[PDB]
Amino acid sequence: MMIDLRSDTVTKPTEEMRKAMAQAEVGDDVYGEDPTINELERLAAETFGKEAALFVPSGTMGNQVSIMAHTQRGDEVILEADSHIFWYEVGAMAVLSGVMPHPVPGKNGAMDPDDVRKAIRPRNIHFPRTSLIAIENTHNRSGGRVVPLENIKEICTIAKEHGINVHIDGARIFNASIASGVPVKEYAGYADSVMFCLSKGLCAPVGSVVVGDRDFIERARKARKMLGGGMRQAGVLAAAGIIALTKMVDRLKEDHENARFLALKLKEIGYSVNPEDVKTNMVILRTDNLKVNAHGFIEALRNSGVLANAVSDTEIRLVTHKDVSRNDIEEALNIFEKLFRKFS
Amino acid sequence: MIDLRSDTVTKPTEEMRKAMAQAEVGDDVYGEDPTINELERLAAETFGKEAALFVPSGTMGNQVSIMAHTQRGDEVILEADSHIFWYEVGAMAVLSGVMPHPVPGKNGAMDPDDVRKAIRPRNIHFPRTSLIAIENTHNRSGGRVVPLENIKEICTIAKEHGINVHIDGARIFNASIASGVPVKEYAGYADSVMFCLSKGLCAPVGSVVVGDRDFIERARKARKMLGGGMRQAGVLAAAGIIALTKMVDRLKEDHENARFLALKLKEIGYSVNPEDVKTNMVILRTDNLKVNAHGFIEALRNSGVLANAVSDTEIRLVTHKDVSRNDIEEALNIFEKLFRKFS
Amino acid sequence: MIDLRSDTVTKPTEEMRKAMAQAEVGDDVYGEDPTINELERLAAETFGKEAALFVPSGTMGNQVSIMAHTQRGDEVILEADSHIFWYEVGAMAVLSGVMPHPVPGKNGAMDPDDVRKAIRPRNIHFPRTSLIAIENTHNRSGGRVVPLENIKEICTIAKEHGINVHIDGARIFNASIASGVPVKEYAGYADSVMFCLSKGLCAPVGSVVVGDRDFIERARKARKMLGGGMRQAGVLAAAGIIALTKMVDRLKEDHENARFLALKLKEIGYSVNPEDVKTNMVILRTDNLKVNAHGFIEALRNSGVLANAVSDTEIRLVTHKDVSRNDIEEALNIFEKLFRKFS
Amino acid sequence: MIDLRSDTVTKPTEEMRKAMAQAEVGDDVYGEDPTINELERLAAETFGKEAALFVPSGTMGNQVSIMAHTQRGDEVILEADSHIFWYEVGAMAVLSGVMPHPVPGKNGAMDPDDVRKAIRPRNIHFPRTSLIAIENTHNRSGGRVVPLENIKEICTIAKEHGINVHIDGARIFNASIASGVPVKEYAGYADSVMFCLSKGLCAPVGSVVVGDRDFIERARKARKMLGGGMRQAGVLAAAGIIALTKMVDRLKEDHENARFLALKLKEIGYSVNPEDVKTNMVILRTDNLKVNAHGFIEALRNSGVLANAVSDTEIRLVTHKDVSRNDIEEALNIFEKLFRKFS
Ligand SMILES: Cc1ncc(COP(=O)(O)O)c(CNCC(=O)O)c1O
Ligand SMILES: Cc1ncc(COP(=O)(O)O)c(CNCC(=O)O)c1O
Ligand SMILES: Cc1ncc(COP(=O)(O)O)c(CNCC(=O)O)c1O
Ligand SMILES: [Ca+2]
Numbered sequence A: 001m002m003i004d005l006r007s008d009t010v011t012k013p014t015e016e017m018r019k020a021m022a023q024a025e026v027g028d029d030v031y032g033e034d035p036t037i038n039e040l041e042r043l044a045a046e047t048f049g050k051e052a053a054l055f056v057p058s059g060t061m062g063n064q065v066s067i068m069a070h071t072q073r074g075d076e077v078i079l080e081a082d083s084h085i086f087w088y089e090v091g092a093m094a095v096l097s098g099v100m101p102h103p104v105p106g107k108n109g110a111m112d113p114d115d116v117r118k119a120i121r122p123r124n125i126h127f128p129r130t131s132l133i134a135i136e137n138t139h140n141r142s143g144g145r146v147v148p149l150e151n152i153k154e155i156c157t158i159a160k161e162h163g164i165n166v167h168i169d170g171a172r173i174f175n176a177s178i179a180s181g182v183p184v185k186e187y188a189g190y191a192d193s194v195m196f197c198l199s200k201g202l203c204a205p206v207g208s209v210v211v212g213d214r215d216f217i218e219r220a221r222k223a224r225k226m227l228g229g230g231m232r233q234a235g236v237l238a239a240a241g242i243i244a245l246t247k248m249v250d251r252l253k254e255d256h257e258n259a260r261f262l263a264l265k266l267k268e269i270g271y272s273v274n275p276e277d278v279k280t281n282m283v284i285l286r287t288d289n290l291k292v293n294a295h296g297f298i299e300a301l302r303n304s305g306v307l308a309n310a311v312s313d314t315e316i317r318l319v320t321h322k323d324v325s326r327n328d329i330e331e332a333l334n335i336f337e338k339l340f341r342k343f344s
Numbered sequence B, C, D: 001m002i003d004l005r006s007d008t009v010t011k012p013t014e015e016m017r018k019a020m021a022q023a024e025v026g027d028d029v030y031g032e033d034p035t036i037n038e039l040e041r042l043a044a045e046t047f048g049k050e051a052a053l054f055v056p057s058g059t060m061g062n063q064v065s066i067m068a069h070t071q072r073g074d075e076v077i078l079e080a081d082s083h084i085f086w087y088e089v090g091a092m093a094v095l096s097g098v099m100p101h102p103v104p105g106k107n108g109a110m111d112p113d114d115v116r117k118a119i120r121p122r123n124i125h126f127p128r129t130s131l132i133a134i135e136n137t138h139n140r141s142g143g144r145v146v147p148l149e150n151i152k153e154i155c156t157i158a159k160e161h162g163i164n165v166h167i168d169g170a171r172i173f174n175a176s177i178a179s180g181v182p183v184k185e186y187a188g189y190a191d192s193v194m195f196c197l198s199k200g201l202c203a204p205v206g207s208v209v210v211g212d213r214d215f216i217e218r219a220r221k222a223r224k225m226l227g228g229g230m231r232q233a234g235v236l237a238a239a240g241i242i243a244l245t246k247m248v249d250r251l252k253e254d255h256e257n258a259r260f261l262a263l264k265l266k267e268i269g270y271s272v273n274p275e276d277v278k279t280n281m282v283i284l285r286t287d288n289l290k291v292n293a294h295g296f297i298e299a300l301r302n303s304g305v306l307a308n309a310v311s312d313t314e315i316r317l318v319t320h321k322d323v324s325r326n327d328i329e330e331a332l333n334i335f336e337k338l339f340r341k342f343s
């Protein structure tokens, strides 16, 4: 088989999950009658210190229903220049909510509070209303970097003074929590809503969850219906979600250790990586000192049994997760070492 | 509890539960889930189309179809009492920026002539009619079957005008079972068809959209945008395969149970028209009862029967896999006792 | 050419041309155009409203109103043959992302009970009904006057449910002249009204929206987004002030001409209903002619008479300031000759 | 009041007022306004394009162009500080459902390589890059002129990828007078161009979009949808024709006044860069003043000079036909007095 370092989304269900899904107690969620979904949402709200939660088929929908519930047509959403909502969500914010993204550069996912402040639009007929500020914790593009709690706190203070909503794209908020030691409820305390994925490092086959106030979640639920996320006996999926949330968080530390090990060794080989920047499950490798670009290196890697994604023409992203063991990492490293000789 | 609210409440068969537990999966975003791929392969084959796309719900199936078939500002001709127009949260306006052009119909069948008259002529003031939608086994009219000839004639009109045709076939198999018309035959007269796996076919989640390759490619991107792009969705697809391949024939049982239920309810004295029961739905009027539909629904629940009121004077009863003949007979004994109380 | 196509073809009076040439202007984006400001003050005053907004067209007038009254996904109740649904290029769906909810009407008058029944109940499957629109002097039906009683009732219903009411008053003055109902009284039963200056009132460009200060503020911003935020628009407002203050009374002349036209056409043998002609429009059916509406329209054009077909069997004739009684007589001689050829 | 806020405040010349009063008009919706038709013919010819469209504002000109070049979910590459992104009410997201893709630029000139990298790869997660917009005489950077070579290289990239190119030429004639490059040459490297008549050219209302026949047809329909479809707009076009054919040359006077203003402000001690002033705009920084941009604008107003702050430390000064050398000289006396007070 292949050593899959493309993403943590490829994680497969554990034995415990397969069993729980196949024997899930279910109901029609449209009627709010699926017991497993209801327990998953109750558990999620509780974990994040929020009043309510909403299960969704993907993180993308989690983000989009949140944007829909937080905005009105013609509004502007302040977000990080390299955030997922801006680059990888098919421009849904424009089509679905009719809102404009207001890109603010960030240092490792951390937008400077004063830059966010300046990004807020003055009340002028020429300008749309800034109604939402979005923050991504463990910013993907920058290498799964951890946004400091103080950063989020400061932005919350600015949002409050202006009456602006705050949404945290916490797709990998648990990785951030494991790395920082900050409980997720703390990050959530400085936001109106938080979306987090169950289908990545937590290993569930499908789904993400949005948490927030009752009225917000009710609005998000209606948005979910409109977008087509209103499923029937979704308890089959939620069963795995419950296990992800309750038993797969602590072991994320193993993915971080594997990623750091990978980074340190890649550095020793001579690759352009920064082990000092690796705090969660991602490693960015630049092909600057290689005689091939990102795409060419990805092909050579595939040809040698290693799978990864090019994130630019000069950068590759390596992601660790439950289905890549330390031994798998060592195997990949031995291959990376030989390839270094070939392309250096 | 005897649940006659809708066929959406069907639960997974033992066969499905086993298949879900041992389902082979992969990341669908990369098109690497083997079970999802097989489900879509089977669905396309079944409806005689080039491709298929699995979606979380029928609503998304309809919406990605509309998006893939239209451009902002277009108009969509659809039946005045269709699900897309009534129960899809106005998604077509928000997601596709298109306007509905309601055409009345007789039990889901729009007069072909009225369809032709609803097509907008080319003029700067008018939107472009780019899609015509037909719902088979029309929900609101009481689960009626739209004649194949009606669909055939509308298709001809569409072709002559270069307009796409979408069949909302959430319950197209019920239509096929009742009419004897194969689903491929219905499909042949349409550009795309959405059908549900999560209703009478008993899958826990999902529907499927079938059509040409280019159409499906556009719909797949629309699905990503809407949030329907899942990961190891093979677990759901495993139940979906069983639903598509082995749960169709038994739909005849739901039809029989519905008719039997209607005939007996009429015998008791309830205001029902057994002659109108074509598929798995029975409409019950409450005009002769001491309490309206909402009050009667509560009496029913207290006695162990679940049903929905669709108006102050109407209740809809829906049969499905999880409503056996025994359950029907038990429900009738309850209806009998309640008639003595509320007539 | 005797132009009976629409009252939009009206050309500026000498008084207007002079007023435009000497118009005092400023930058409207800064709210500094004094002539625009006066036009809006006068418009608000005339309709008994708090504020007013000048727009480049009636279509923008209706659309900024819809945007200001609704949110994405909302539903808008409107008459089945209203201009907003048929002649505004599906703008409501694209610009506001809203769903139209057509309701049948008798010459523009929707039965109040049907409106009440069109209001969506609070359910996750349904959009929220946030607006009801009424067109006074309903175009399609032949410039018919909607009864004030009808408007009052719908207003009462709207209040109960907290729904906004917008009156498409493109020809509200024609309705007032014929009914004897002051435009301020019509306006009192609505949250917003759009009326045109560019039709019967003869201004070359523009309409105005009137309503509450906050609503107008939202409409103004919508106007900026749509591209209606002009600069020295006082040039157009000068003609607008004259249209609003000096051209209302003479509308009776267009009505007289329209009625006379209809009476004579009936005597010739054409399918018209002189008794239904109360303002400046005449609907002419072609069911008793050798050619349909499109064929008859071309014949009329070749003979010097311009009109538009509103369907395959109906032609709309409209009178206005640029059509004198003499022009009507000449037209009648032409219609007389064409009846011999096509009856 | 000496108005240096913008060139939008320009008022009609006597020649224009007379032309508007004597304007030959018609109903534009039927394409029958002779003056609008000639303005569009002239605009098209002037820019070396086959068609043109008159619009109520530059904002609508840009937006109908975006609508006609894109499909829902598309992405539009544009300069980070461009008007379309910052000053058009987020209209591109609402009207066309498209995403802006900001690219840094040096005085309006995006590096061609950056543009190349901003184009989205074909992937399900990414919107399709279907349009690249370029603003000539980039407003925010001080009315800077984008080099013809920059537009030429971007055009090559666009062609290579089958992507449309739109030039926001609101002040493209200022660019042409300063650079010596004919507007038809800039436009030769674009698919469409929008230019304003209501700014430095002194028309009271409007802009014009030029491009291919089909594109313009789509833009015309978009205009109808947005509410820009006017009637006897010839009154406005009459002034537009004069603006286009007689007000271009004198733009050099505005540039001369801007330069003179910059040189004297520098001489006084203000933070300005005369070397950066190539058209009708001067950027003044408040860095060496005991007050911020907002406080300074207030001081200028109390002394009789109007200007706009574009940031907390920068104010924009704009020259035009209604700010003569005398006014500049008078303004300088005020600036001199204020410098003593705030330095
Ligand atoms: C920060 C972030 N946010 C939102 C999403 C969307 O979730 P879905 O894929 O479930 O829609 C992703 C997925 N990112 C894919 C990856 O990093 O490989 C993500 O990384
Ligand atoms: C009732 C009504 N409402 C709104 C509009 C739109 O106004 P503009 O044409 O200025 O956009 C019209 C024009 N109707 C076309 C006609 O009767 O000739 C109309 O008749
Ligand atoms: C480059 C540019 N583009 C488009 C527009 C929009 O045109 P309208 O204002 O006619 O909609 C403006 C106006 N700019 C105002 C100013 O700079 O003072 C502009 O400067
Ligand atoms: Ca997974």
Ligand SMILES: [Ca+2]
Pocket: A327, A330, A331
């Ligand atoms: Ca090893």
Ligand SMILES: [Ca+2]
Pocket: A232, A233, B007, B008, B009, B010, B011, B197, B198, B199, B202, B203, B204, B205
């Ligand atoms: Ca089911």
Ligand SMILES: [Ca+2]
Pocket: C007, C008, C009, C010, C011, C198, C199, C202, C203, C204, C205, D231, D232
């Ligand atoms: Ca007119």
Ligand SMILES: [Ca+2]
Pocket: C231, C232, D007, D008, D009, D010, D011, D198, D199, D202, D203, D204, D205
């Ligand atoms: Ca001007």
Ligand SMILES: [Ca+2]
Pocket: D325, D326, D329
């Ligand atoms: Ca002098």
Ligand SMILES: [Cl-]
Pocket: A024, A025, A026, A027, B011
């Ligand atoms: Cl169960």
Ligand SMILES: [Cl-]
Pocket: A071, A072, A073, C070, C071, C072
């Ligand atoms: Cl909204």
Ligand SMILES: [Cl-]
Pocket: A012, B023, B024, B025, B026
């Ligand atoms: Cl597997």
Ligand SMILES: [Cl-]
Pocket: B070, B071, B072, D070, D071, D072
């Ligand atoms: Cl589109």
Ligand SMILES: [Cl-]
Pocket: C023, C024, C025, C026, D011
């Ligand atoms: Cl003036």
Ligand SMILES: [Cl-]
Pocket: C011, D023, D024, D025, D026
């Ligand atoms: Cl004229």
